[PDB]
A paper describes a structure:
Establishing a new lectin family, BC2L-CN showed specificity for fucosides, especially blood group antigens, for which the measured affinity reached micromolar range. A novel binding site and binding mode for fucosides was also uncovered at each interface between two protomers, which implicated an essential arginine residue.
We measured a Kd of 26 µM, which classified Globo H as the best ligand to date for BC2L-CN. The structure of the H-type 1 complex belongs to space group R32:h (H32, a = b = 42.7 Å, c = 308.6 Å) with one monomer in the asymmetric unit, whereas the one of the H-type 3 complex belongs to the C2 space group (a = 74.4 Å, b = 42.9 Å, c = 102.6 Å and β = 96.0°) with one trimer in the asymmetric unit. The following N-acetylated sugar, GlcNAc in H-type 1 or GalNAc in H-type 3, interacted mainly with its acetyl group. In some chains, the acetyl group’s oxygen also established a hydrogen bond mediated by a water molecule with both the next glycosidic oxygen and the main chain of Thr83. In the α1-4 linked galactose (Gal5), only one interaction was observed between the O6 and the side chain of Lys78 from the neighboring chain. Those interactions with Gal4 and Gal5 were not seen in the protein chain B as a result of a different orientation of the O6 of Gal4 and of the terminal nitrogen of Lys78. In protein chain A no density was visible after Gal4, which presented different torsion angles than in the other chains, resulting in a more solvent-exposed sugar.
Residue numbers in the entry:
A (entry chain BBB), B (entry chain AAA), C (entry chain CCC): -2 to 131
Write the structure that this text describes.
């Protein structure tokens, strides 16, 4: 159609620790397949129910990446060194990409805060709305 | 218009406890009334300042529902069994619905984590952007 | 173009305390410049990695404002009087503005919860998608 909305969603990912960004499997939008080659994409990475396990102020970094690498990043962290319980910390990240540059895909990634294990066990999404410059 | 944006917003809701999803009153989009019958809707449920009261790791589940039921859901929870103070835990949930299936409305819902009372006493919104497949 | 997306992003702001909303420098969209004069804007304020310092349940209020003042606001706050460590508390706020009113700009603002110092030291964005009424 003339006003493309892209969406991918997951309900889980294998629990891993990583010092550097690794893909969140399944949060991937094939932009080239959509025939988006010019304009802008507003991309939302929505991880509403994550938690992190660890023993030194745990948390998770998340990123929106294209084939050109990370475009935006943010994290949550707990406020106790060893939380009584690793509570659910909703996380949203929003970035606008110029597709002209040579973007063929957008994806979600994550990485450990201070050696934390990274947990998704319910709904998470990666969404993009296509538009133009003003 | 040719590029509809739907929006509903509230500033409060009666405080309730519920084991199962109940509507957040006022967070409701009448899609049929808009004449949306085909394409996709990106729906954001934005509850930026909620809190939960309770005695067993309190929190709130939130959902986006259509007439076909829940499409996505997430929660926040505290990281203490009995928080010193029930702090404000911003919550965002994003989902993309294919409208063809027979969607006439989109709404926000909530339900208790472990018997928590659910509090909204400031701005919350439900938004939707209409588009098409790629 | 015929389907504008507006975007502004920062990576930091001078740390300040403020009893009333002050601008988050750099989170500002010039809507008049875009030639948006009618329809709707869905505006997201995305502050994914903030923290607050203070000694009385710290937190930050955030707002979306136009030339007509604040349209929506929300806050995060910690659940301890003096957090062990001021953890990162992702914050998103979404609002839909009718541009006809006389809107020339949209901006993000913030203010202190109970005298908190307000910290941004990584990516934050302010985004807007243009549409029409249904
Ligand atoms: C609240 C929580 O984290 N629940 C976890 C649980 O954590 C337990 C520890 O916090 C523990 C230390 O003793 O105290 C509690 O458990 C005690 C007791 O030990 C237990 O035997 C007894 O039956 O209950 C008491 C209550 O005080 C904590 O509850 O760890 C286990 C790991 O085995 C689970 O992850 C549990 O997580 C929950 O599991 C549920 C199924 O029983 C269900 O799926 C819940 O949704 C899930 O909780 C959610 O995820 C958690 C990681 C957390 O984020 C919570 O806020 C979420 O609601
Ligand atoms: C977790 C944290 O807050 N890290 C801050 C750090 O805070 C230290 C203090 O909080 C301290 C008590 O006041 O506890 C720890 O430090 C102890 C000890 O006191 C210290 O001397 C020793 O080296 O380590 C131990 C560990 O128990 C806290 O670590 O203060 C420093 C210096 O001022 C930093 O801000 C640190 O922030 C981290 O800094 C990193 C760069 O070195 C990096 O940039 C991290 O991203 C950043 O942490 C993040 O921001 C924090 C403010 C907090 O939000 C954390 O959750 C984030 O991950
Ligand atoms: C810090 C807080 O929660 N204040 C909140 C207070 O909570 C206390 C708690 O601090 C501690 O001492 O334990 C006792 C008993 O458990 C209380 O729970 O209770 C007060 C009395 O009802 C209020 O609820 C107070 O809430 C604040 O009230 C002021 C005006 O009185 C403003 O309206 C604040 O905005 C409001 O704080 C906001 O909501 C509270 C629930 C919390 O989310 C704060 O982080 C938040 O800023």
């Amino acid at each position: 159609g003339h006003m493309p909305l892209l969406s991918a969603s997951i309900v889980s990912a294998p629990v891993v620790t990583s010092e550097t960004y690794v893909d969140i499997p399944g949060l991937y939008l094939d932009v080239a397949k959509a025939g988006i080659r010019d304009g802008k994409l507003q991309v939302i990475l929505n991880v509403p129910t994550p938690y992190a396990t660890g023993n030194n102020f745990p948390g998770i970094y998340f990123a929106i990446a294209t084939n050109q690498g990370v475009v935006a990043d943010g994290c949550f962290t707990y406020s106790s060194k060893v939380p009584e319980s690793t509570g659910r910390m909703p996380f949203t990240l929003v970035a606008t990409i110029d597709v002209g540059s040579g973007v063929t895909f957008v994806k979600g990634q994550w990485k450990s805060v201070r050696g934390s294990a990274m947990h998704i066990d319910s709904y998470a999404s990666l969404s993009a709305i296509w538009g133009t410059a003003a």
